[PDB]
Design a protein around this ligand. Structure first.
Ligand SMILES: [Cl-]
Ligand SMILES: [Mg+2]
Ligand SMILES: [Mg+2]
Ligand code: NA
Ligand code: NA
Ligand SMILES: [Sr+2]
Ligand SMILES: [Sr+2]
Ligand SMILES: [Sr+2]
Ligand SMILES: [Sr+2]
Ligand SMILES: [Sr+2]
Ligand SMILES: [Sr+2]
Ligand SMILES: [Sr+2]
Ligand SMILES: [Sr+2]
Lengths: 154, 156, 95, 140, 186
RNA sequence: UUAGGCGGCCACAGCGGUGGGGUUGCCUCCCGUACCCAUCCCGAACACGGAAGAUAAGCCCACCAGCGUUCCGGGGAGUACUGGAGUGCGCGAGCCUCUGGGAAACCCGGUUCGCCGCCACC
RNA sequence: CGAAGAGUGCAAGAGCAAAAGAUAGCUUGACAGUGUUCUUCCCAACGAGGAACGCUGACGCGAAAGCGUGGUCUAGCGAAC
RNA sequence: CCUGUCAAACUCCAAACUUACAGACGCCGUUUGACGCGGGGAUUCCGGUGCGCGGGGUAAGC
């Protein structure tokens, strides 16, 4: 399961690429989505590769982000262990976070908005004109690397 | 006309003679030089390697070839060496010489397309490299920068 | 194009690979298809008659009855749906 | 082994290539059966401004008609060797062509399941001279 | 095969056994075929159908099994041919085959021919087959009269040993009779 | 399939070559022209009638990889080319990195001297 | 020996070998009526023209399946009054 | 035999890629009625630039 974060705007973005981001439920810069690793999805994220930051996050980071940014499929309700317990097939955020990673469910399937609307990266990111291997912030990241990003956008 | 007008591969391949007519003959006298009676069985084999893809008109091919071979008469009219210009000018080139109206050009010449790193000239000799000087003069009359390369010689 | 006939620019697609040259096997010129069956459309260079407009090569239509021995195949050209008269010789079952 | 390998005379074609005839009258007398005319393909300056038209005639003799002919035709000829085809054939001369071959020939002349005779069953120049020579006359 | 481009005929063309042009016009009918083939000693009639992996023989008869019903004569003549046609035809009937189209292969459509007799036989078996009475033998020849009268110009018995002495087309009348009702393998 | 008929795919089946097989179920070559039918001339062929002879042809079986072909491993080659991205380089024609794909020639070694369906048959 | 380099009326590209080529013989389907579909006009409306494919009629050749709605396919065409 | 070269109107090969149809996942539609159909009203038929691929031209803010 990968964390997908749009870091490059829509303007001048090819339409079928932007259309793909929207199919992955992201419609704004900095929004994040948890996409399971399937041949199908892999093709999608490869297409979006140059406008996103993606990689498998750690249980802890995914838990932090869910606690700090997850939202109800409808409403401004707070998503905490109490919320998760009385609304989801899980007992606490961790349980959820674990199911998401093990790809046994999705945020929508549990009644949460598919997107995690993140805050701009504190201290800024590595840049949107180069991929990870070249020192930029685009493309596939280390679990350690993707975590650094998500934590900064917490 | 200047090399400027044709040195670049900026047009589609135009070589089919079944559809092109009136192509000027070639100014290149020979392609095999030296004791072409003998085989490439020599100790040293140096070669002139073009460093950029370009189109070389037969005009420059003949000037460079002469410049080198003529000089390789530091070895003698019937000396002991081999020399081959391995490229042939297949690309027919034109010139629009009514302004931009019906401007397809008329055949005015032919050039050889040579890609970066291909060797245009190859010489075969005994430890008698007066040829390296022959190519300094040769590379002196063709568009691209070139590098002289000794292919089989540990006889420093 | 310099002209606009039915075979304009059909040099490649209406040409057989050297080994597929010569009269084609009759087995497939007699194949029977059922209404509703998905079929691929491709003209057979060796077969003169029963062809459809070359523009439609590559289409995969749905058989919907027949006219004489030829078949009536439904397809969607762009966004417009058309019907194509085509003999077995130029069709192959899908999958 | 042999027998189904020993040479045979399958057809003797006698023809005259005039280029104009009543020559059919004599070709029919010296052979025994009715002749047939030969047309000439392609037109030529030698006044052959006609493609489909009589230029000559011929007669193909098979079996007895052929032997009864060669018995009185071979004596007329002389030469041999360097006058024999690679297929063990030979022609001399009005022309006289003798077609020789081994027993299983029909396999390449029939309609159904035809097949071209294997080079091993194919007659040979030498095998030909032998057969003929071994039948009322001499070689070279 | 000289190289990459060389074109090798289809197998059955290579072997000179299947005329694919005639075969096509043949299949157009949509009907089964009355494949009529023959040899020097025997004759054969098969009712064939088209199949996903090759043709299908639904019925058939061979002059060899003609004996099983009382045939004591040679098997490469007209009476044999007719009878085999009838035998296969009858078997076809049982199998549910109602009609067919004559497939004479690489044989010639010679009037009076055996392939045509094979056809008359199958038609008499009740099979509906597109034909032309004007191209079929005149019955008496089918019975083998042409062979009896040939033996009339005796001097030496036609068949080396075999049966009879002066031959019997009547033997044919017996077999046709024996076939038009009852009997096993039918 | 101890030799057959009709095929499907239409060279993995082609080209060329070696060996084996017939009182018989057979296929053939073969023998023969009174008939049906045939030759713009020939029972050569086509057609018909038939078994004295043969396994030399064909055919069927077993096999050989020199040529042609199908596929596979290794090398060529992740090269050539390339869909996406870049305030990366180059005076420039042009190149490079990242991401997703990815040849061809050729060399070397294997495979391939058809496979499959239906009917018939010591 | 020879899968095709010939030939097939004419450009070019394409098709064709027990033929779509050659020869011979016979024949007039280069036929009448009325349509379907595509084309003309990719997608997407537009006429004349064209083609493929049906039904009916009448025929030719063939043993028959079948072939013939002109010449193997794509040019050779023209509104109202 | 060997040795040196090519192709917009060459191809024994052969991509990336584009494309028909179907299934899956995604997204979307069934009170926001999508897909589709019928009708009213248009405007519009001087375009330009970057990037990729171009064809012409020595080139061009052609
Ligand atoms: Cl037969
Ligand atoms: Mg909300
Ligand atoms: Mg043997
Ligand atoms: Na074909
Ligand atoms: Na044999
Ligand atoms: Sr240009
Ligand atoms: Sr002016
Ligand atoms: Sr220079
Ligand atoms: Sr004979
Ligand atoms: Sr400059
Ligand atoms: Sr790969
Ligand atoms: Sr036609
Ligand atoms: Sr395209």
């Amino acid at each position: 399961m990968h964390a997908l974060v749009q870091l490059r705007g829509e303007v001048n973005m090819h339409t079928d690429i932007q259309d793909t981001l929207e199919m992955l439920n992201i419609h704004h810069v900095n929004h994040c989505t948890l996409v399971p690793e399937t041949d199908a999805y892999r093709g999608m994220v490869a297409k979006v590769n140059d406008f996103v930051a993606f990689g498998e996050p750690s249980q802890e980071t995914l838990e932090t982000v869910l606690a700090t940014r997850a939202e109800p499929l409808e409403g401004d309700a707070d998503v905490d262990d109490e919320w998760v317990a009385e609304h989801t097939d899980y007992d606490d955020i961790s349980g959820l976070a674990f199911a998401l990673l093990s790809e046994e469910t999705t945020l929508r399937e549990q009644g949460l908005s598919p997107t995690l609307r993140l805050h701009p990266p504190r201290g800024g990111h590595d840049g949107v004109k180069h991929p990870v291997k070249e020192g930029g912030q685009l493309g596939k990241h280390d679990t350690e690397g993707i975590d650094d990003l998500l934590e900064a956008m917490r | 006309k200047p090399g400027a007008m044709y040195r670049n591969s900026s047009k589609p391949a135009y070589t089919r003679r079944e559809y092109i007519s009136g192509i000027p003959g070639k100014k290149i006298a020979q392609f095999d030089m030296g004791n072409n009676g003998a085989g490439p069985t020599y100790p040293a084999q140096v070669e002139l390697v073009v460093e950029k893809p370009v189109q070389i008109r037969h005009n420059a091919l003949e000037a460079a070839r002469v410049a080198a071979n003529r000089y390789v008469q530091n070895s003698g009219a019937a000396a002991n060496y081999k020399f081959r210009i391995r490229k042939f000018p297949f690309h027919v080139i034109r010139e629009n010489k009514d302004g931009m109206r019906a401007p397809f050009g008329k055949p005015v010449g032919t050039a050889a397309r040579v890609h970066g790193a291909n060797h245009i000239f190859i010489a075969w000799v005994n430890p008698d490299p007066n040829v390296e000087e022959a190519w300094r003069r040769a590379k002196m009359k063709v568009t691209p920068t070139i590098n002289i390369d000794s292919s089989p010689a540990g006889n420093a | 194009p310099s002209s606009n006939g039915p075979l304009e620019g059909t040099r490649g697609k209406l040409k057989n690979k050297p080994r597929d040259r010569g009269t084609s096997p009759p087995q497939r010129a007699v194949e029977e298809f059922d209404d509703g069956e998905k079929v691929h459309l491709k003209i057979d260079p060796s077969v003169p008659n029963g062809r459809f407009h070359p523009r439609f090569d590559g289409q995969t239509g749905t058989v919907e009855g027949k006219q004489g021995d030829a078949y009536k195949v439904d397809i969607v050209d762009g966004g417009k749906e058309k019907t194509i008269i085509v003999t077995a010789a130029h069709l192959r079952r899908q999958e | 082994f042999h027998e189904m390998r020993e040479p045979r005379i399958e057809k003797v074609v006698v023809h005259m290539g005039i280029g104009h005839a009543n020559a059919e009258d004599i070709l029919g007398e010296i052979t025994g059966q009715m002749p047939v005319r030969t047309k000439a393909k392609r037109t030529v300056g030698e006044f052959d401004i006609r493609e489909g038209d009589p230029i000559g005639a011929k007669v193909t003799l098979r079996d007895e008609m052929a032997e009864e002919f060669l018995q009185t035709a071979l004596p007329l000829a002389e030469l041999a060797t360097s006058q024999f085809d690679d297929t063990g054939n030979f022609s001399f001369g009005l022309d006289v062509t003798v077609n020789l071959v081994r027993p299983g020939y029909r396999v390449a002349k029939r309609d159904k399941a035809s097949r071209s005779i294997p080079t091993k069953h194919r007659l040979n120049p030498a095998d030909a001279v032998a057969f003929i020579e071994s039948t009322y006359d001499v070689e070279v | 095969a000289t190289g990459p481009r060389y074109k090798v005929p289809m197998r059955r063309r290579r072997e000179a056994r299947t005329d694919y042009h005639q075969r096509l016009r043949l299949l157009k009918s949509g009907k089964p075929r009355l494949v009529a083939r023959k040899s020097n000693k025997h004759v054969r009639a098969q009712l064939v159908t088209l199949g996903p992996n090759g043709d299908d023989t639904l019925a058939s008869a061979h002059s060899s099994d003609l004996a099983e019903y009382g045939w004591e004569a040679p098997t490469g003549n007209m009476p044999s041919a007719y009878l085999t046609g009838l035998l296969a035809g009858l078997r076809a009937q049982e199998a549910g085959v109602e009609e067919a189209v004559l497939d004479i292969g690489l044989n010639s459509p010679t009037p009076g021919s055996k392939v045509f007799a094979i056809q008359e036989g199958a038609i008499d078996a009740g099979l509906d087959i597109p034909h032309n009475d004007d191209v079929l033998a005149d019955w008496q020849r089918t019975r083998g009269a042409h062979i009896a009268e040939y033996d009339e110009q005796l001097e030496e018995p036609l068949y080396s040993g075999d049966f009879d002495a002066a031959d019997l087309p009547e033997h044919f009348d017996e077999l046709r009779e024996t076939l038009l009702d009852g009997d096993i393998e039918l």
